[PDB]
């Protein structure tokens, strides 16, 4: 600390608040795959209608009244949605003229901020948490991933969706890209796209997997070989590769087709302020933010999840 009036030389003040940006989960879905629904909490049932041919068509020659038939079928799927809330403290609106100068926004000593800035920061944090839930299917605030919040049934993410293809790379081959690629080939062979195979594909990997991929193939790269392998099965359409720090020794492969994978989030999934505001005789007030989780829908055996066991 300087013993002279150093505050005199503080002739410029810049405050970094950021801005509520678009969630990064939008990059993992096509524009057609996302469709909002009107719900806050509970379950919603979606019915898929289907048709099939019972026999060969009938030739219309001379007189005939016995024609082949076309049958129909239905399937009911139930999706659960959960409502969650967070609380944050902020300055009361009438105290801003006393707690805010031209070179200040709030109490630096007490970390007290006005409602707009506090809401923006909280919204950013909640959007990050929502992105983590969508990518992983679990809710946690620890880097270890433990202390997970128990969730409702029929609430899954891409990583933990049941009835999908799961491959495991043994701890003895955790650093063998050849073994990893063999497992990936097995999963791709077990993939079942049916008549919707002509679709773009998306791959999500962890930084260690990306580092291994950019290595030369054992002058070609493992990434190029994987792209060619995926193009072999997706009718040689676009294959996108992404890296996320939220994953750990996991590889996710899935198509960007609405006929197989859909996202029906609640129209209140993103953070929304609550009407209740706690007030008292002091200058500190509290506010609440609501958000809704759930809504991922997938067909059977259309997602490949590879886990590289570390030990």
């Amino acid at each position: 600390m300087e013993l002279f009036d150093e505050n005199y030389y503080a002739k410029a003040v810049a405050n970094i608040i950021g801005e509520v940006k678009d969630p990064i989960m939008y990059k993992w879905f096509s524009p057609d795959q996302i469709e909002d629904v009107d719900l806050q909490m509970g379950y919603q049932k979606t019915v898929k209608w289907d048709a099939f041919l019972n026999a060969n068509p009938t030739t219309i020659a001379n007189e005939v009244n016995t024609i082949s038939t076309i049958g129909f079928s239905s399937e009911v799927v139930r999706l659960n949605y959960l409502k969650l809330q967070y609380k944050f403290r902020h300055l009361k609106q009438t105290s801003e003229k006393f707690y805010t100068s031209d070179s200040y926004i709030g109490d630096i000593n007490n970390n007290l901020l006005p409602f707009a800035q506090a809401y923006k920061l909280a919204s950013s944090e909640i959007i990050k948490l929502i992105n983590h839930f969508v990518l992983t299917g679990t809710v946690s605030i620890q880097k270890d991933g433990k202390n997970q919040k128990r969730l409702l049934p029929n609430m899954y993410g891409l990583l933990n969706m049941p009835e999908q293809i799961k491959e495991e790379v043994a701890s003895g081959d955790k650093d063998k890209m050849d073994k990893i690629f063999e497992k990936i080939e097995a999963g791709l062979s077990k993939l079942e796209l049916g008549d919707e195979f002509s679709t773009p594909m998306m791959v999500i990997v962890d930084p260690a997997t990306s580092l291994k991929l950019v290595k030369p193939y054992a002058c070609e790269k493992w990434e190029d070989v994987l792209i060619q392998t995926i193009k072999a099965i997706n009718n040689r359409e676009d294959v996108y590769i992404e890296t996320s720090n939220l994953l750990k020794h996991k590889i996710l492969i899935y198509p960007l087709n609405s006929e197989l994978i859909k996202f029906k989030p609640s129209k209140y999934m993103l953070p929304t302020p609550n009407e209740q505001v706690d007030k008292d005789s002091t200058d500190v007030a509290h506010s609440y933010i609501d958000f809704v989780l759930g809504g991922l829908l997938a067909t059977r055996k259309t997602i490949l999840q590879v886990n590289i066991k570390q030990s």
């Binding site: 939008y26 990059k27 909002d36 676009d238 996108y240 209140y268 929304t272 009407e275």
Partner: peptide, 28 residues
């Protein structure tokens, strides 16, 4: 917005419009 319900609906519509704009401006 007349009331909080309309305010929430406006927020949801703004979020939807932002998502649509992001997907329109996205180039892979």
């Amino acid at each position: 917005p007349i009331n909080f319900t309309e305010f929430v609906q406006a927020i949801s519509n703004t979020y939807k419009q932002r998502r649509i704009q992001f997907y329109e401006n996205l180039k892979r």
